[PDB]
Amino acid sequence: TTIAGVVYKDGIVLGADTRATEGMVVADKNCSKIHFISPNIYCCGAGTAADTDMTTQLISSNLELHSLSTGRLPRVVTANRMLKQMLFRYQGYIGAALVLGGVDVTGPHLYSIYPHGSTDKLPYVTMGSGSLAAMAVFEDKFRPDMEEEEAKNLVSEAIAAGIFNDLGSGSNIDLCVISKNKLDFLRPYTVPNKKGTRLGRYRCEKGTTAVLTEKITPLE
Amino acid sequence: NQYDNDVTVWSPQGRIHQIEYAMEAVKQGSATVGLKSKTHAVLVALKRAQSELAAHQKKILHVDNHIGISIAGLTADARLLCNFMRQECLDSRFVFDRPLPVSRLVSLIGSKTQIPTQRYGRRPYGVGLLIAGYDDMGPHIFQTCPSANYFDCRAMSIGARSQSARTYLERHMSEFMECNLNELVKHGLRALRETLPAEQDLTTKNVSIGIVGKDLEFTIYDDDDVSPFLEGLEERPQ
Amino acid sequence: SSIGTGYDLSASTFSPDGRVFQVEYAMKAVENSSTAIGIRCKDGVVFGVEKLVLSKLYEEGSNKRLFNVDRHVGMAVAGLLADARSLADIAREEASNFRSNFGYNIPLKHLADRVAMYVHAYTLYSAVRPFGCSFMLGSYSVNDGAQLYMIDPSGVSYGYWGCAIGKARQAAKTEIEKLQMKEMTCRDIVKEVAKIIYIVHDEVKDKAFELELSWVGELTNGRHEIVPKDIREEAEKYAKESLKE
Amino acid sequence: SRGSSAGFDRHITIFSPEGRLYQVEYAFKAINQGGLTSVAVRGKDCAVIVTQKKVPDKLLDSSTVTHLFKITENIGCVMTGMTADSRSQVQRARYEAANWKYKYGYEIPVDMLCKRIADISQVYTQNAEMRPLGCCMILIGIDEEQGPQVYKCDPAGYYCGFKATAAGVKQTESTSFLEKKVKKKFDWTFEQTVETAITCLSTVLSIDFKPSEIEVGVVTVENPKFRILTEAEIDAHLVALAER
Amino acid sequence: YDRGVNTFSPEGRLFQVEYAIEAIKLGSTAIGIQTSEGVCLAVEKRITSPLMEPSSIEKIVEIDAHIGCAMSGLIADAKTLIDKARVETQNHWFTYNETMTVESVTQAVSNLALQFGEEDADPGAMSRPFGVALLFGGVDEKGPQLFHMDPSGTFVQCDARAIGSASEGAQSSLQEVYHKSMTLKEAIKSSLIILKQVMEEKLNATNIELATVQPGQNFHMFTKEELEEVIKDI
Amino acid sequence: AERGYSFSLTTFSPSGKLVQIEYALAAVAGGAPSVGIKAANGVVLATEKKQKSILYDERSVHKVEPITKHIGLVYSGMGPDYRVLVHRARKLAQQYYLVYQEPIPTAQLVQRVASVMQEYTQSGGVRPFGVSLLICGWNEGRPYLFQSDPSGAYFAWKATAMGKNYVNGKTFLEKRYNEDLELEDAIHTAILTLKESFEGQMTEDNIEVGICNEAGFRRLTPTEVKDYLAAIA
Amino acid sequence: SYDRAITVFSPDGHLFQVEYAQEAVKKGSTAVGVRGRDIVVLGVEKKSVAKLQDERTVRKICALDDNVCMAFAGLTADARIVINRARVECQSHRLTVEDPVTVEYITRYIASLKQRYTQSNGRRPFGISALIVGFDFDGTPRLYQTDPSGTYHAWKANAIGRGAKSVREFLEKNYTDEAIETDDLTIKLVIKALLEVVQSGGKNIELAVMRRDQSLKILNPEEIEKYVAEIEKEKEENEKKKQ
Amino acid sequence: SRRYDSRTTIFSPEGRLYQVEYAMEAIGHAGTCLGILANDGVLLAAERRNIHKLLDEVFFSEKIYKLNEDMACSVAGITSDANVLTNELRLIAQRYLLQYQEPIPCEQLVTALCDIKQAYTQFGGKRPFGVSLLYIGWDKHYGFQLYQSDPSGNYGGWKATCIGNNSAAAVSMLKQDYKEGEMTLKSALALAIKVLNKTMDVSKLSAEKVEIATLTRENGKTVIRVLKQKEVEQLIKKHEEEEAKAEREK
Ligand SMILES: CC(C)C[C@H](NC(=O)[C@H](CCc1ccccc1)NC(=O)CN1CCOCC1)C(=O)N[C@@H](Cc1ccccc1)C(=O)N[C@@H](CC(C)C)[C@@H](O)[C@H](C)CO
């Protein structure tokens, strides 16, 4: 994977690739790694897929309960606390590296959360097998208080670096822009990789497959 | 009548009837006496018999080499408390390699016996105890009640018609501190015999003696071993 | 002030006028006990207890109603003695735990608070009955000061300059009010304590009694100790002499 | 119906034939046993608590007699009713607040604290083994966006936010006073709030307090920390009242 | 008016225990006699029907090869105690490689006395006392010994003792004929005589059971023939 | 120290009546009235939110509560019990979602909450809830209205009322209302059937309304209530 | 859990709950059983014939193992519990000990269970009595009877339930060595004893027999009608030509 | 604590359990519910108490629960307790299925629930479940089957029986028109219509007021179907056309 996050003037941009691997083989060419926590908080997941899924889902649920009882919009510190405390309670056995981004009543907040339960609040963060490349892009071309499109360009650039330089990352670039009054969950923000077009027709015509046994069963 | 059946129910007069009813259990047993000199602690117990064909009930129990007790009340509760004291003493020897100070053991008895007097469905211990012990604070006679209250005594008597024995001891307190062992046991036996009509008196068949001291571990004299104490006593009055 | 039609058989049951009669009954058990007073001077706290003697057969110092809860904290009890002792155990354990957790001697206000909460925990269920005793905690420190607190069976805890509990609670309080303990010292105070004890004592209804006394202050390095036989006999002499006027 | 009873519905927390919980009401009556009254008033830029300080003894260290409790640096409270139960509920409140901040990373809202305490009380209302607490809790504190907050919770499990409330003996009289004073619509400044509270209690008890007869908790927007007024700065308001 | 099972009477006794003592009085009467030649235990079977196999009525059982027990009252309650005794003896043998003294066994069983209660207790704990009375007759290092135990848990040694419905009368009749030097035959004879006196049915070889434990011979349950040969010299 | 009473506080009378449940219903039929109307394209819940003074802050505690993004709640009876049931219901919904990754069907939430309420009529040392619940929802295109009473029983309603004068309100709805209505119309007849027991000037702060269409559940703003309470709009 | 003493002693020394359970047994359908030389027979009376009820699903006779069968009287549900626990025990015995089970053993188990329920907290005595029947190895046929109290005995023949005293007296006056000298004669004795209390029929009587090393055999209403015909014939060929 | 205990699992002096009997009294006030066994199937028919103009009707049924692909049940008494017991029944069925990989025999399921109910009558100090149940099903051991279970934990297998309000008269009426071995599903439906007609307090009987379900064996699989209002109306109308016919002969 190759997830990143940045903080600009009006909010937060989250990025992620869409490659999921098992072994050294691509299992999913299009995997959504940017997860819904609350309507104002999203979280990118890298590492053990099922772990990132169930963890992000659980915390999303608990936050829904929380805001349901409080009647207010959830804070990012809350999701951060829940995540880090759960992850720490399991001492790293839950393979979940996370980039938590959201806009509060206190403003934009971006955390990185490692599977052992430690967190870092930074203007920009990267996680995943392609995190070094993305972090290089950030360290090279980041400036405080960027404009929205500028930050989107930066993050997509980082994720791209992860995609082309890391064998663990591949395929599309997903973005998520979160401002004080907007939520752009841009799915296929960029499709920089395309499968080559077939040069032949290997279509098998009806009858080429020999059959030993047949049984039709009507339904409704 | 509505404050009678539970140990967690205060009466409007600031009393707990179950505790007092438990206190009445001590008076149901045969009387017993305890007194100390300055070197020895002595328990003298009047054993009771159902019929003439039944042996006399044990009233003196061994706790530790330096501690013995005399019971008055429910023998089951007595055995329970006894085993508790034995266990605490063994623990003290196991941990510190020194005998458990008697006062501390008594304190533990208080703490343990206090608990069931404050919990619903529980009941007080229906037994009174006289504890004779010796440590580096001298001899000790203690008294423990079903109310979980305990007393450090110079002399004491508990049980059926023990009032006579009490009245006797209260006169000879001043003598007690300087008596030799034989005189101490004598006084104990007189106090004990005071709790009897003139038609009956002490016998080797119905008297037990427990002795502990600076020169002697806790020992129990029951039958023919009691005679050297009985033989050497006045004829008593009528 | 007297209802009892099933509404007074449990601490889990309110009276129709909003009272918990079990607690009040326990308080009445406190009232039937011999009076124990304690007074705070500018340099510590002194305790005095009217320890009634039920028999001459009992050794001196038996049934102590003055306890060492901590090396800097003393406890004076009034009422059902067994409960008082158990509460002394609870207080001791609380102080020990506090030391083992935070590394210094427990502040008196906090100890009183904790133990009081523990007591209150018994005024709420039918499974247990309220403690049948009231008690006073006394302490002194240089960084803290002289402190005296009191707790009743309900779980109420308060800080006093002078306090009394038992039969002649009010009769003792009226005598304590006469003193100016905000300026006096624990050395002078002992005499006055013994005096008030002898005054409040009823030589007619109640038989013979033994007087217990306790120091805790600057004169004892912050340690709660028993009053030496000299000072005790001195105070008793002062009291017996002051009883002839 | 209309006062009917059956079984142990007057001894434990079960339903009466008319669907009432007698033990709860009895607990409300147990609140009044203290013989005191507390008043809470919410301002435009603050929140104020005032309560009787009946110290009938010179033998009491009057500093130890308080019904005002600091739950958090920014959350204060006043308890009315049975003292021990009150202190218990205060401990529980402090725990729930500290735990809240530990788990969620931000200070607990007065709203949520009061809601929690009330939710705990409901259990006492529904379980027969224990009896509700003979006390009422009033919390005050500044909220990040909703500003000054004054909440209150009952032994019944009821909790609510208020522009003003009272608790204890002269509760109804104090409320009837406060709503009459609210309808007039004044400029709810700090002094207006404090004076309204103190005068509510005063004209409800007909006492005209000395500065050592009451205690006043307070929390401002400019100073969100729960502050307890000294005898002097209470006497200031007291002498400020006897002029107009 | 209902109360707890561990409630005290104003007299200072436990109601349930006293009621258990009252329960014993409805049981089959049994007699145990101690003799320097051995201990004997006899008990009526109280057969309520000719169809009932009398050999399935055992009120005398073997605790161990050197200890036997006679019971009176609610037998179903006694079964548990008997098994506990057997288990205790076997545990003691396993641990110490020796037999238990009769007093130790009796005490061990007596430890289950007031082991009943409601609150603050185990789920399988006893709810009520055992409505049964026991006579432990056996031979140890202190020779022949006979012990008696009641629901109170109070156990005591007896030279001769009768328990059951006809307790008092049989005890008087026992006092009239006991001297601390009887032969075992005399003890058996006396036992069967008093038994015949107190029983409502005609005493025969299938009406009762008798067993002896002697220094030289293990626990022996008297067969029909032997019973007849003792009943013979009525 | 504490444990708990292990015996039922709710038992059968010789006639065969679970008396405590009936008394609970007596508590229910005594609280503020609440109406619920299913309307083809949505559901409406409405209740009398009449405080008891000008000092009360009506914008702090609500009677119309959301369970999830598509399910809503109102009640008749005791406030605290309701609050408890709301928390529990929300939790149940979140459990269902965590397991199935699909918003819980209204009927299912109703059944589960009903089981929870049923427990307190048999479990030890507890009384039943003094609360009847009206639960609205939007699942699988169709709208849903349910009621659950203290016994743990539940019924599906086209329209109904609970609380004070629930009989008069039931006949009112039975007459002056029917199917094919739009959400607006339903809200109108809901405030109208609430007005049939409003002994006072029914303002926008005296009543609370929540709606549940196929776009989710939400509580109507006091402004929208003002527009509706103008006997029009 | 429910830590409450249910069965306690009364001031006169009675266990009221147990006695009540025995009264519940008294209301049960009459169940009798006799022991023979090579057969053993158990029969149960008033089966509450509704004729709309399946007879199989309400049988009061149940097999515990291939060796032991059992009838009961009292609360049917409690009886189901006891029966199942008994079967489980019968298997567990085979598990821990290679040998099967003796009638006395399983009887002792059931009795101990009942007693345990007479002395345990929060529980309540089983309202049943049981007639246990079997042919343990060595060939000796055995019949036992249990009681809610926990007491158990062995019998040559016995009866429990409604009017058990009547059938007990009848069996007392009719149990001879001549009677039950043959299998059919023992079965006829059971049928007669049952007819001496049942509401005069045969369609009200359920009878089953265990014999030697064979399995348990339940008698069809046809065979029962045949034996009842022979019984009604012997009551008119030896009681009509003499009276 | 000991004072507030109502002693729910205790013998009465006569040797009976009062809470069970009172629960029976509760069931006697519940909607009439009967079941009849035939040669080609088995059916349940129950009175509906949830009969109001404003009810929404969002379920397949009201008092008929599907337990297993070969089994269904009907209920009478407290409906919530009924919910508990039915859910538990489904659980048991699925456990047996998970274990033996074949459908649970009907009697085994019934006994399984009844052991729980009995357990509630013997210990725990809880009130019993105020519910009687009728079970219909098919299995490879005993084919078509009808059962009845009471809160006592007691159960029985019936060829035809009734439970609920006016159950006695319904039982005798079933005794009258019974037909051991000659019962078809159609005649059983006629019988159901008849009995439910005379027993239901509100006469005339609309299809609105009753609820009928049938379990049958069709081509290897087991079919459970709840009749639509129209079919019920057909049965009712036919019953009236058979009642006004026999009354001609006078
Ligand atoms: C194929 C998809 C649906 C999921 C894939 N699952 C898998 O690879 C799972 C792993 C299950 C597991 C068990 C115990 C402990 C840990 C993991 N494996 C299997 O399902 C089957 N195998 C069993 C034996 O043979 C090998 C695998 C996966 O997790 N891929 C991870 C990489 C990984 C890390 C650690 C352990 C196992 C796998 C991934 O894509 N991670 C991305 C982040 C996303 C998915 C949030 C990235 O990190 C990018 C793609 C780099 O991998």
Side-chain angles (χ1 to χ4, degrees), chain D residues 59-60 63-96:
Chain D
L59 300 178
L60 274 176
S63 53
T64 70
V65 184
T66 318
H67 287 267
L68 305 188
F69 295 105
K70 178 189 297 183
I71 306 302
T72 322
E73 291 293 335
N74 313 278
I75 289 184
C77 107
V78 60
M79 301 303 301
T80 310
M82 300 176 56
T83 300
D85 299 19
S86 296
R87 302 230 166 91
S88 172
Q89 208 172 57
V90 168
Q91 292 281 17
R92 186 58 174 272
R94 293 171 168 178
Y95 170 78
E96 294 290 341

Side-chain angles (χ1 to χ4, degrees), chain B residues 111-124:
Chain B
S111 290
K112 181 183 187 58
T113 53
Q114 188 277 340
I115 296 177
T117 81
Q118 206 171 3
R119 300 201 191 183
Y120 193 90
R122 295 295 236 95
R123 70 162 218 256

Side-chain angles (χ1 to χ4, degrees), chain H residues 32 108 113 158 225 231 240 244:
Chain H
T32 306
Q108 301 198 26
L113 191 69
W158 296 86
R225 138 177 47 255
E231 308 174 73
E240 301 198 44

Side-chain angles (χ1 to χ4, degrees), chain H residues 172-175 177 179-182 184-192 194-195 197-199 201-203 205-208 210-220 222-227 231-237:
Chain H
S172 58
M173 199 178 314
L174 283 182
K175 283 186 174 183
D177 299 33
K179 53 272 169 57
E180 290 196 43
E182 308 174 19
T184 65
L185 188 60
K186 196 54 185 178
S187 55
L189 284 165
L191 221 189
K194 182 180 181 182
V195 174
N197 171 76
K198 189 170 181 179
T199 54
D201 190 81
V202 183
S203 186
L205 253 76
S206 60
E208 169 89 16
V210 299
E211 193 174 85
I212 302 182
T214 62
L215 185 146
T216 45
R217 209 86 237 279
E218 295 172 12
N219 240 274
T222 298
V223 180
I224 298 180
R225 138 177 47 255
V226 180
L227 303 186
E231 308 174 73
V232 185
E233 288 176 2
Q234 302 168 32
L235 271 308
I236 299 171
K237 287 279 186 172

